[model samples]
Target chain A: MASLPKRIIKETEKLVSDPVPGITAEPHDDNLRYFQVTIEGPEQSPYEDGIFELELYLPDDYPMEAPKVRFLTKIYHPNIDRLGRISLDVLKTNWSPALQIRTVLLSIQALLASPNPNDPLANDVAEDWIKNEQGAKAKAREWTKLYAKKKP
Target chain B: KVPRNFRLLEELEKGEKGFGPESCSYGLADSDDITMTKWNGTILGPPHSNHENRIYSLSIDCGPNYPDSPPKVTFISKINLPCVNPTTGEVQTDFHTLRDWKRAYTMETLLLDLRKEMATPANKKLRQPKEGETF
Candidate 1:
């Protein structure tokens, strides 16, 4: 078992207390290093009304290293690959030790608002999005309306 | 020339500080003109799979061609998973491996890959121990 770093521990604590509006995270009691996160799709986005679940594992070298994040939920997005892998810049090139889990999840939500076809992992979806913007947007909207059912 | 991106010195210092989790351990391995870090990782048996209670060890070699290229990870122990070749315990050969490796890629990502591999449907029928079983 590895002890949690003060940075991660503090971030996790803040996330639990403040709790992002449409996201929830639960840290495992036995393993503070791992946490279960759920993000609600941003309103008015194609994925709106849908809920996405993912697992986040903080490495001992976090801050210097990005936390390992994978989607547990099945979502349809141009940027997210078939394997539930997300293509957020912060997770890659823009990664910095200063970023926290809350910010990452929020960025994912923003991704739902505008899918970047330019650097898409799912080329097929990207093509559809680029060639037929309206149709692609409709599909996304439909998927969100059908899959993500928010209670409000 | 030893690539500065390998971060051998930095990782060595981190290892010395014991900044690694039980699931993954990191060490420095060197050879003539070829210095590398050998990451030894253990994936805990999945909660609801036959692999539960089994400690699987994996070896990761971040060679000279790293950051730009992904390290190679192999399961030292035999385990069945779709993404992995049971006989060799190596990740399936594909473009996904190449395209995914970014300069930002780290050991944490590798361990997660192993975890996802274990969760694939091929191992679905396997029976795992109940929640509290320790082996």
Candidate 2:
């Protein structure tokens, strides 16, 4: 009902016009602050060829603070907790004001390409990956095919 | 594109109209649309200081989630200040605009905040880059 800020409008413009490759985000019609995002899994990763969905929320202090993001599509990765919360330093400790929406999405995409079990957000997933590396990769691949595949 | 909501647009308009030639001015960045995300603003240095008579350019990014989120601000005019990035013009996370964000705040308030920073005792005497030279 009110006017959106220039920054918001402009940021949305760039995001829509020249979006990151292999990634797309659409904000809710009613709530511009909330977005529905889809990212293609990185090649060579267990999750390759899959599409991952995520929900992102811009807090009041956006760039000053951090956007709250979570996975919407199910995934099997040590860095992604069971609830879909991702554990990434840039989202937390290493955040910078210079970072933007595309940067975050790209980082997440890269995370999928390289899973770091040593710094795990999901203990069980990390354990599985450690005890049975092949099994974990196969399970990740299986889940990707199951939940991330296109619906007919 | 028109503003998504009036709250932010109204403030931007207010910021644009509220200032005198001696004060600050803000508009969409790079001829961007009214309801767009980035902004280019300016502040004329106050009278009687090392920064006196200088014109400072600034970049502001509201990222579509404004009011709920603080717009990221940077200085296009070169200077040595804790609040801004000397190389990129991006402000730091601890900038007051972000540290104490309130929906009640407006674009005018943000420009005013940066103005206050430039006029601070510690920075008023701080040597500044040449006029019109961007970072």
Candidate 3:
């Protein structure tokens, strides 16, 4: 039998053995290298009740570099542009070999609590948030309420 | 066993072989067996706000197929930024995780971009912490 991709195999095993709370990950049945993730928003923040989806792909190089991650869900935040692009620094600059999909997903969940307006992909949203805190909060709440329904 | 695409390993070996100085900067332990190198980083506390003195940690995971794709960076620490993910310490929208990860991109490039990100007006308006408040 053909061997599994090392990164995928390792990451998949991890997900199965030590699943992270509020998050789930699984590889596409056809493609082991590509995986899907779902994260629940943390409590108290705007997105607290929402479930966000993401797509992850391991490069052939795997752990030697960072994996490709993106938000599959539509989130309205200053750091994430309308196109669903995020502008966090670690994804590009501080990626370490030790980091894994679990850690990365956890980081993304924490991001929901704090949007970095300073390093924004959506400049306009950042500007609005800066100039008007109340408005920004209201909008964030709106988005959360609209997208992330409260669990019964 | 090691994966086939061990670019960082190759680079580290090349450096050890006297090829040249290490191109990327920063390293972190992925696990007991893996040591990740050549990371991208950035930090911008709430400028002029309560979090001003805080130096947040950011990290990106640029897998072996780097330069050909975009790198993925996320905040490791918590901060109050409009564009950032409050819960995951990640940006809350769709981003090009691989689009910008070019082969020629270096850790410095990502750091600079984050520096610029922290200088935005929204982030600048946050309450800054006093000198001793930094962590």
Q: Which model scores highest in DockQ? A: 1
Show model 1 residue runs off by greater than 4 Å.
A145-152, B1-135
For model 1, give the RMSD to the true fold: 17.3
Instruction: Itemize residue pairs with steric clashes in candidate 1.
Output: A49-A148, A50-A148, B50-B127
Query: lDDT tens digits, residues B41-125, model 2?
Result: 8888777776678778888887777777788888877876667776887878787777788777666677777778766756447
Q: Which ten residues in a row have the lowest lDDT in candidate 3 chain A?
A: A81-90
For residue B58, model 1's alpha carbon misses the true position, in angstroms, by 20
Q: What TM-score fits each model?
A: 0.52, 0.52, 0.51
Model 2 misplaced stretches (Cα beyond 4 Å): B1-135
lDDT per residue (tens digit) for residues B77-128 in model 1: 6666656664776765462553567766566656755676565646574444
* TM-score (C-alpha, index-matched) for candidate 1: 0.52
Model 1 per-residue lDDT tens digits across residues A54-128: 767776677777766656565668897544567888987898988888888888778878889999978988999
- For all candidates in order, the CA lDDT equals 0.68, 0.76, 0.62
What are the iRMS values of all candidates?
15.0, 14.9, 12.6
Candidate 3 CAPRI-style tier: incorrect
